[PDB]
Amino acid sequence: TLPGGNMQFQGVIIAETCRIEAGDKQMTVNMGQIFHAVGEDSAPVPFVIHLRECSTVVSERVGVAFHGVADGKNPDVLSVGGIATNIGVALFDDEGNLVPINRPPANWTSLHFIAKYRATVTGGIANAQAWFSLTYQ
Amino acid sequence: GVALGATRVIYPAGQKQEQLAVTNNDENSTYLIQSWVENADGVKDGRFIVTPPLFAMKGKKENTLRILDATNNQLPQDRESLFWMNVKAIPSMNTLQLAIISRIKLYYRPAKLALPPDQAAEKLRFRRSANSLTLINPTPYYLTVTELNAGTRVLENALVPPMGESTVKLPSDAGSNITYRTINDYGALTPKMTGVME
Amino acid sequence: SNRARGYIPPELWDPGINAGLLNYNFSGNSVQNGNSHYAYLNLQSGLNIGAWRLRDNTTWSYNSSNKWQHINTWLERDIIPLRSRLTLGDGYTQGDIFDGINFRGAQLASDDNMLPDSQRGFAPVIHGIARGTAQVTIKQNGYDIYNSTVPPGPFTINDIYAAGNSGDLQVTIKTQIFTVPYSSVPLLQREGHTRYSITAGEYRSGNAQQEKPRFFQSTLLHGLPAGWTIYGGTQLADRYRAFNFGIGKNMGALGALSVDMTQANSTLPDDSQHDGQSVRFLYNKSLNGTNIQLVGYRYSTSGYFNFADTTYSRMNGYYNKRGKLQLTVTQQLGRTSTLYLSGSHQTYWGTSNVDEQFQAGLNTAFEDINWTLSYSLTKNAWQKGRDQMLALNVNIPFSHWLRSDSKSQWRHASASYSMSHDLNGRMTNLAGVYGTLLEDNNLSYSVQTGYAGGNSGSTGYATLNYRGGYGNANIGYSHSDDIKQLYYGVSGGVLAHANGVTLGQPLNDTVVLVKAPGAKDAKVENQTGVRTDWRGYAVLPYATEYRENRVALDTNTLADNVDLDNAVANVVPTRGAIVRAEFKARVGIKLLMTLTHNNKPLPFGAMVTSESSQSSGIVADNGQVYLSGMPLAGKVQVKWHCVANYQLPPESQQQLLTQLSAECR
């Protein structure tokens, strides 16, 4: 038995951003095919977004927001682009409050949202895209 | 899903380029990753080029984003400058398409700074107005104040610009004692500090 | 049919490439006092043809005050279906239940590394009935070890991470809450876990007098339900016949106790048969301030000799043990200090010889300072010498005083101090400073002046280890009262593969040959001083076997003309596999064209593939397509066909990113 020597281990650990995964794979929200008054809504359609693989410190201070192409008739509703006209897609939170699009990020591990058709009327194919922006403070 | 390598990117001045890791853990998924850098005000700026701006990731594949420098040495050398690194992941698919934009902070840090990064958070001071709270930041670093409690009540996080101040709402009945935490370069909350008023 | 956590199917493991290998380790010692020169050259050959792994060792000695000596040769292989390996040729036995011996023959042993990282060590399986769909949560020390959702019906969880001694796993279904405490002994196995080490061949030993008899050492450690672990063995040989049998148990809170009885009929070189026995106990207790008490007892009966003692030469050549008690206590005083109290005791047959070996130790981590106080009482009754040594080691990193952002090279240095009192008047202290020097943290200076107290001669040393991109080298000087040694060693590794011979750092079993043609001097990520050759190939010293490694090229160090398509690649290597991770290094001008067509920017998503030079890039927005590796001329094909021409002035080569605007056809 003889003395050895000092051995020093060095390294740095860094955090990471929460990986976004929707319950419906490929980040696609089916709405199906397509209102007595303007502003009436259709059958609700739910989808979930999971912020996984990150500590609760980061996941609590993430600022969530929505962006999208505002409809010409309704600036607060996503436009749908044989294409249905005078209609759009509206996003409602779990509590039932409408989430305006193109708004400054607000502080919201799993997020539930509901997409409902809002009439601004002809039927047809309706496709819309939504930007789900997460600011990492 | 797609996840960035780090929550904030520190860009040292004079360094040719910096890297940011973009990971994908889903085998059966195709993601078109679009990236760009905005200025502190949220407006797209051409002073930082992120290459490749657009590329496709099939399978469990992770790439590295090379954030080139194009400022030509025009930003101040006496204080930090804040930029917003943006990464959008378009899923290459009546349906609704969801594209995630993981915006993160990008600090352009000049080489010569008096205060070391660790000894800068505690130099933040406070000033209690009638119904507002002002945070003086004499250090040249951007300071992210989180878990800001003024007595028994919790306030809102504020990002204090260097050599400047910010303002947050303050209830009239909040206790005089003020405590805060700051997020360091690694994205971990520092040990609790007491808030010395000015 | 749920798969274990972190499971790599056996369809993704890479056998490797049909490549050669050559590992050389030179060493020199020019002692001065008449000056004698030494040189111990070491050669490790190899040839990885197919799935087989031929290996070889050769040494060459030299003395100034020339002989090639062969050592080892084996053809190891991995038999994936049986989760085992085949070490045909030379090797050594595991020596877990028996005692390890070096042999020259076939050996078929199960390999634990082929299993996922979760199903390793000991961790009890969790049974139970969860009515309906619920979410089981394994609570231990207030932590969520395992969080998952369970379908209705009985459920088995066998992927619990091996957490050592620790405490009790409080399963929390949703709500019959039942606790599952567990302890561990190194010889315990999970439920359904089996190991075996069937062996054959001759007995090879370093000593010249020992003979070389045939032997057959088979072992087996089959886990059972309820924590029991039946393990047995048979070291049947020509004149030595042993039958080891044992049975372990996980008693939960009380601890874990392993008992095995070994009967060995031995025939000593005096042709005198000696039947014997041997009973071994290993007891583990924890969390009693967390006194981790480990007790190990091994009793023996006269006539019990191990195989190493019945293999000696005949009677013309020229005290068996009775009991060995080992006690170990580890108590943590606070959140920094940990006190160690080791112990050892032994008796002999016919003699009162007691070989006590008591060792204490107080290790602390006061702020940056990591000061260690140690105590040792090495006692042998044959010499009747206490040999009490009281050592005090200190470690003061220079970062404790320097700034955090300082660019000074002293930031990596770290002082030290090693006081060593012998309680007999002899005192020894070495106060030295070590740390890294070079920009890439390759060079490591370790100047450590030292003094000795009665002789009074000072002891100086200055080692300079350099972990370079071609081969490690070090010129270590050492000065003393009348000795002035000057070491000089050179290491390295040659990997002769299909595309050519590439030098690298000393290979450590599994290697990764990165192929990046056209990229010169690019550092690989998370490796110290590993750089590509002028051809573009580099050799990673090491990569974990049967796991998913990560190979990356640090894009900062790439040249101003080389852009990579994929800068990160992962390889899953088998043990002793030269796995090739290939990167495409596009060499040329990086140009960001603002492509336009009919005075309107091209649609987002349009593919742009060049013609003259192989390159591609999707149009981001407003027609900004990022094309890499493009020459000073040529055309692009826009498909969404349209063809656009661009003409780059010669000044474009200097600029890192040459933005231009070209109107498409």
Residue numbers in the entry:
A (entry chain I): 7 to 40, 45 to 91, 95 to 121, 129 to 140, 144 to 160
B (entry chain C): 1 to 93, 101 to 205
C (entry chain D): 121 to 153, 157 to 188, 196 to 304, 310 to 423, 426 to 455, 478 to 613, 617 to 802, 809 to 833
Authors' text:
Uropathogenic Escherichia coli strains use filamentous type 1 pili to adhere to and invade uroepithelial cells. The pilus consists of a flexible tip fibrillum, formed by the adhesin FimH and the subunits FimG and FimF. The pilus rod is a helical assembly of up to 3000 copies of the main subunit FimA, terminated by a single copy of the subunit FimI that anchors the rod to the assembly platform FimD in the outer membrane. The assembly platform FimD in the outer membrane of uropathogenic E. coli is the catalyst of type 1 pilus assembly.
